[PDB]
Structures are given as C-alpha cells and as structure tokens.
C-alpha cells in the first residue's frame, strides 16, 4: 500500500488531497505538512478536515516524518516544492508535483533532480485536460499554420499565478506540435496600442474571479470560421483523485520525469 505525505495540508488542494487519499483503498494518509508559522501545525489531519481522527499530525517539516511515507503529493508554492524535491533526493522518496508558477530555471532544476528521483509533474491532474492536450496537437497540425491561436483561462480570485500552468501547458503542446518554442511566440499581455497581431503569436488572456475551479479554451481562428476546444473543471476532487492515482502509479517506479500522459497511458 502506498503511504502518502500531503504537503500543505490546510490548503485548498491539500484538504482535497487528504480526503482523496483517505478514500482510495490502495493508499494511506501517512503525513501532512504546513508552513512553519501556520496556525494548523500540531493538529490531527482528521480534525482540520473535521472528518474524525487519524493517528497523524500536521508537521512543520516533512523531514521529521520521513520514515512514515513513500510519496509526497505537493500542491504548494514553488520554493516549498523545491525543498520537498531536495528532501526526496536526500532520503530516496518520490514526489507528485501539482504546483504551478515555476520559473524557467526552476523547471530545469526539476528535470535535473528527476534523473535521480521518481517525479510526476503536470499542470493539471484531470483526465479531460490530458485528452485536451492531445486534441490540441491534432488541431495545431491541421490548422495552426493558417490560423490565429489564442488561449483563454478563468480561475478563482485566490489564484496567485497567471496565466495558469495548464494554459501554458496548452501553449507548449500547440507550439511543440508546430515545431516552435512557446517563448518565441507567446504574448501574455495586450495593453494600449499593440499594432496589428503578428501571424505566429499565441495570445493569452486571463480571468480571475469568484470561485471558478478552472476553465480553459484554446481557439484556432481562420477567416470565416473558428474552432474552440474547452475544458471546465467543476470540483477540485477531480484533480485530487488524479494526483492520488499518480502517487499510486509512481510507487516503486524507477526515477525519471513522468507526466499524467505516462500515468494514464495517453501518449
């Protein structure tokens, strides 16, 4: 059975991850962390959740509990995740990363550690999104060369990064299937006099409001017609369940950089 440490257990995803891992019968909630300054350190993981009591307490540092768990599920902040990634390297653990907003250099660092550590990383742990990446590739091969490509995403008021990791991933899939690099073509803001749109740009627009769990749309626009491919998540549990599945899959897997495409068999 896989023993799961939930980083950032009081978070939006953290709470859902605890619930999901608990309810998966091939997984045990073995540990949980929060920020050292946090109000919820010392508390039982059942209690914060409010659902009865497990025999586990929220730790201020996962290093203290390394003998209780095999896999970290990390949906936190980039700095905190790099720490947990180091921890995995030092003590031979695995990690499922759902955190987004990494810089280009941090990503490379993750690829490096992933040579030695078994790592699952993805900007979205839902099945739909993974299918959407495949659909985008096919659309881009057929229409990309002749069309304007735009990505639009919406999320709740609390999301700190823009555009979403998923939006960027969408762009990467699109750019990749056309033989380009996203950073060459991406346009993240349009303000004032932008002039005429270039032929190759991939525009990003970002909506932050309410409690939206997550909507994404990739648009391919020609003259006279357009194609839109859209994903809508309505419950975080969709992500959490997929992450826990990833953790189960990852257990006793050789070190490397794995994506949800690998976990699901969607390549």
Ligand X SMILES: NC(=O)c1ccc[n+]([C@@H]2O[C@H](COP(=O)([O-])OP(=O)(O)OC[C@H]3O[C@@H](n4cnc5c(N)ncnc54)[C@H](O)[C@@H]3O)[C@@H](O)[C@H]2O)c1
Ligand Y SMILES: O=C(O)c1cccc(C(=O)O)n1
* 42 labelled binding-site residue: no
Instruction: Note whether 45 and 69 are within 8 A (CB).
Output: no
Q: Which of 8, 14, 118, 123 binds ligand Y (CB under 6 A)?
A: 123
Task: Give residues 47-76 in contact with ligand X (rule: CB under 6 A).
Answer: 75-76
**Residues 175 and 181: beta-carbon distance below 8 Å:** yes
Dist. CA 265–CA 267, nearest whole Å = 6
Nearer to ligand Y, 43 or 212 (CB): 212
Q: Taking CB under 6 A as the rule, which mask of x and - marks residues 1-20 in contact with ligand X?
A: ------xx-xxxxx------
Counting contacts by CB under 6 A, is residue 98 touching ligand X?
A: yes
Minimal CB distance residue for ligand Y: 166
Q: Counting contacts by CB under 6 A, is residue 258 touching ligand X?
A: no
Site for ligand X in 159-218 (CB under 6 A): 161, 165
* Residue 198: DSSP 8-state: P
Catalytic residue among 19, 28, 159, 245: 159
Q: Which long-range contacts (CB under 8 A, 24 or more apart) does 36-40 make?
A: 36/60, 36/61, 38/10, 40/9, 40/10
CB 265 within 8 A of CB 133: no
Question: Which of the listed partners (ligand X, its own copies, ligand Y, none) does 211 bind, with a CB threshold of 5 to 8 Å by partner kind?
Answer: its own copies
Strand pairing report for 71-74 and 58-59: unpaired
Asked if residue 98 belongs to a known ligand binding site, the reply is yes
Cβ neighbors of 83 (< 8 A, separation 6 or more) are none
User: Which residues lie near ligand Y (CB under 6 A)?
Assistant: 100, 123-124, 155, 159, 164-166, 214, 239
User: Which residues lie near ligand X (CB under 6 A)?
Assistant: 7-8, 10-14, 33-35, 38, 75-77, 80, 98-101, 122-125, 161, 165, 239
């Amino acid at each position: 059975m896989v023993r799961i440490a939930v980083a950032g257990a009081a978070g939006r995803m953290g709470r859902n991850l605890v619930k999901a891992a608990h309810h998966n019968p091939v997984a045990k909630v073995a540990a949980g962390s929060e920020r050292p300054e946090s109000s919820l350190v010392g508390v039982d993981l059942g209690e914060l959740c409010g659902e009865g009591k497990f025999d586990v307490v929220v730790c201020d540092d996962l290093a203290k509990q390394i003998d209780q768990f095999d896999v970290i599920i990390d949906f936190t902040a980039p700095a905190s995740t790099l720490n947990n990634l180091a921890l995995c390297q030092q003590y031979g653990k695995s990690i499922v990363i759902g955190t987004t907003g990494f810089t280009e250099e941090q990503r490379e660092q993750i690829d490096l550690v992933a040579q030695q550590v078994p790592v699952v990383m993805a900007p979205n742990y839902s099945v739909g999104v993974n299918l959407v990446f495949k659909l985008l590739e096919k659309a881009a091969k057929v229409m990309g060369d002749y069309c304007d490509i735009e990505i639009v995403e919406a999320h709740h008021r609390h999301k700190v990064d823009a555009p979403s990791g998923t939006a960027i991933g969408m762009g990467e899939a699109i750019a990749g299937a056309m033989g380009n690099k996203l950073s060459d073509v991406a346009v993240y803001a349009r303000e004032g006099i932008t002039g005429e749109r270039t032929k190759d740009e991939i525009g990003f627009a970002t909506i932050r409001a309410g409690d939206i769990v997550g909507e994404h749309t990739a648009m391919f626009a020609d003259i006279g017609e357009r194609v839109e491919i859209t994903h809508k998540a309505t419950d975080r549990m969709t992500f959490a369940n997929g992450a826990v599945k990833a953790a189960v899959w990852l257990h006793e897997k050789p070190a490397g950089f794995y994506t949800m495409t690998d976990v699901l068999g969607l390549n």
